[PDB]
Amino acid sequence: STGVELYLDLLKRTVSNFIYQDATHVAGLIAFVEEARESGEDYPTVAHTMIGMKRLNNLQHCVESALRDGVPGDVLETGVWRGGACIFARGILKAYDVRDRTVWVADSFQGFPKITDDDHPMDAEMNLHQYNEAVDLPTSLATVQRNFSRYGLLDDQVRFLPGWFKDTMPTAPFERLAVLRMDGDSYGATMDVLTHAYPRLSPGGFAIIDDYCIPACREAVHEYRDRHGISDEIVEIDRQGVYWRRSA
Amino acid sequence: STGVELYLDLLKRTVSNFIYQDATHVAGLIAFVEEARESGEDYPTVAHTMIGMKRLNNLQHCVESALRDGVPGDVLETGVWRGGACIFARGILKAYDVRDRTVWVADSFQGFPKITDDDHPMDAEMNLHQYNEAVDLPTSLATVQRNFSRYGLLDDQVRFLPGWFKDTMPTAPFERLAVLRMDGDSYGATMDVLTHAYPRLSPGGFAIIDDYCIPACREAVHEYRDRHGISDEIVEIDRQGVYWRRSA
Numbered sequence: 001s002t003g004v005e006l007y008l009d010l011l012k013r014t015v016s017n018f019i020y021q022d023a024t025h026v027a028g029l030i031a032f033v034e035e036a037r038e039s040g041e042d043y044p045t046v047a048h049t050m051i052g053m054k055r056l057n058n059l060q061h062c063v064e065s066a067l068r069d070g071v072p073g074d075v076l077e078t079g080v081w082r083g084g085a086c087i088f089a090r091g092i093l094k095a096y097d098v099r100d101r102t103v104w105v106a107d108s109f110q111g112f113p114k115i116t117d118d119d120h121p122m123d124a125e126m127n128l129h130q131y132n133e134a135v136d137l138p139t140s141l142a143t144v145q146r147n148f149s150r151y152g153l154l155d156d157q158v159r160f161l162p163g164w165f166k167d168t169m170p171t172a173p174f175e176r177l178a179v180l181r182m183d184g185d186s187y188g189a190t191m192d193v194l195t196h197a198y199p200r201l202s203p204g205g206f207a208i209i210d211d212y213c214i215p216a217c218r219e220a221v222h223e224y225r226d227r228h229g230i231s232d233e234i235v236e237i238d239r240q241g242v243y244w245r246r247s248a
Numbered sequence: 249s250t251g252v253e254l255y256l257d258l259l260k261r262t263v264s265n266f267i268y269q270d271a272t273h274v275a276g277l278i279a280f281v282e283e284a285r286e287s288g289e290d291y292p293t294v295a296h297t298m299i300g301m302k303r304l305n306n307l308q309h310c311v312e313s314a315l316r317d318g319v320p321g322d323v324l325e326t327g328v329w330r331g332g333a334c335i336f337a338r339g340i341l342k343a344y345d346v347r348d349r350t351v352w353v354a355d356s357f358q359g360f361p362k363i364t365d366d367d368h369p370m371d372a373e374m375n376l377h378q379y380n381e382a383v384d385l386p387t388s389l390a391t392v393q394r395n396f397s398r399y400g401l402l403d404d405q406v407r408f409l410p411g412w413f414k415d416t417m418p419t420a421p422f423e424r425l426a427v428l429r430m431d432g433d434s435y436g437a438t439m440d441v442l443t444h445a446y447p448r449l450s451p452g453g454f455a456i457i458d459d460y461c462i463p464a465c466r467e468a469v470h471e472y473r474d475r476h477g478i479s480d481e482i483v484e485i486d487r488q489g490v491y492w493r494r495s496a
């Protein structure tokens with residue numbers, strides 16, 4: 001109805017490529033299937049995000065909620081792949097003409113880390129690194145930037161954090177977050193980012209776990225929530241993502 | 249950038265698929281080339297229009313001009329292929345929340361006509377029918393409708409005119425046009441539509457010839473303009489399209 005609604009709606013359909021409905025890579029529990037892209041259950045060969053429409057909608061709800069309710073801070077995604085969700089997020093801010101917040105785009109830009117003997121047992125058991133070729137996960141900072149540019153959204157309110165989260169997170173140059181989107185799939189990535197980034201999540205802000213259904217990740221989420229006495233309700237989004245809103 | 253500007257801009261980039269940059273069919277004067285899609289010089293394997301960005305921009309200018317300047321009537325495209333330009337056109341109306349105008353989508357829905365002995369010599373010399381398989385031109389009404397749906401724009405303000413223009417135009421159910429977009433490539437298609445549709449083009453409205461560079465088409469345009477004493481300035485868009493604005 002409003003121009004904002006149309007843009008954002010179109011942007012969602014575009015980053016997920018509902019428009020042209022590109023094939024999926026063959027991997028894990030897996031030709032374009034509408035119910036699969038709606039819920040983010042597939043591995044797109046061309047689309048700029050894999051999170052699907054329910055998680056895009058969630059992301060929109062979180063950012064919009066924040067802006068409306070005056071929650072201060074930036075938006076950060078840890079694990080961006082081709083950048084779609086961050087593109088969308090920069091889109092949301094452009095739509096409401098916000099020039100005081102930034103979208104932080106954090107990634108190895110090389111896919112999943114090789115497993116070390118440091119790594120948590122579960123992260124070792126699933127070796128997400130092996131699925132990198134199969135799902136075209138290694139995606140360079142340059143490629144990601146190009147994609148932003150294609151939507152007309154690459155600019156000084158998009159900043160990049162190339163590197164592993166353990167290295168890039170503790171000392172990253174943002175002061176406060178309104179939305180923290182975790183999409184690392186592993187215990188390590190999730191723990192790395194909750195540990196070093198969650199403290200900067202403004203009260204009122206939102207924490208999103210993209211793959212709560214993965215046990216390694218779920219473990220980290222609870223270990224972290226236990227440790228800090230966090231009891232904010234965990235709300236499901238689709239078949240794998242959840243989020244909570246931080247109270248004081 | 250207001251929400252409207254973003255939406256329309258994104259829509260243009262989307263129907264022309266600047267976002268994902270699909271391959272071109274190999275034909276005529278012909279891998280994605282940016283300068284070619286900008287000007288509508290290639291034959292997209294996936295994109296929803298082949299007219300490129302300059303002609304989309306032209307289309308936008310014509311529709312916006314009309315709305316602003318109170319020019320009454322609908323929009324009609326004769327020759328829509330996969331529907332992109334009509335999709336965009338329906339988009340424009342949605343963006344400004346217009347519910348009193350319709351987008352008319354006219355086509356064989358089977359590609360170019362087989363050549364008969366009726367046909368104009370030039371249309372016979374060309375036999376545009378032969379390029380149908382090569383450029384995936386035959387596109388069913390159903391397929392086109394699906395595409396509209398994918399942008400969330402298939403609704404009761406989009407009406408279809410399946411058939412050859414000879415048959416569909418003279419008796420088509422629209423009373424007045426604000427924009428008439430002719431994209432048939434041939435003398436026949438152009439003449440068919442100028443003859444039977446142009447008289448309903450409101451004064452102030454716009455007539456767009458997509459293929460003025462094709463001699464058969466150019467012939468029809470002049471023959472028609474001379475016959476009716478039309479001297480409205482012919483303005484070039486890119487390497488092949490032109491348009492004029494109708495005065496009284």
Ligand SMILES: Nc1ncnc2c1ncn2[C@@H]1O[C@H](CSCC[C@H](N)C(=O)O)[C@@H](O)[C@H]1O
Binds near residue numbers: 106109112183
């Ligand atoms: N320890 C770590 N540090 C930094 N980046 C990591 C990491 N572990 C995984 N990643 C990255 O996280 C991403 C996982 S997929 C992320 C999908 C994305 N949110 C979307 O919208 O489609 C990959 O880009 C991968 O390179």
Ligand SMILES: Nc1ncnc2c1ncn2[C@@H]1O[C@H](CSCC[C@H](N)C(=O)O)[C@@H](O)[C@H]1O
Binds near residue numbers: 432440
């Ligand atoms: N005499 C005629 N009557 C009806 N349709 C015709 C016709 N001659 C050609 N066509 C149709 O006109 C189209 C030419 S291609 C048009 C491209 C389209 N405007 C875009 O935006 O990409 C083809 O789809 C073909 O099916």
Ligand SMILES: [Mg+2]
Binds near residue numbers: 183
């Ligand atoms: Mg994930």
Ligand SMILES: [Mg+2]
Binds near residue numbers: 431432433458459
């Ligand atoms: Mg043409």
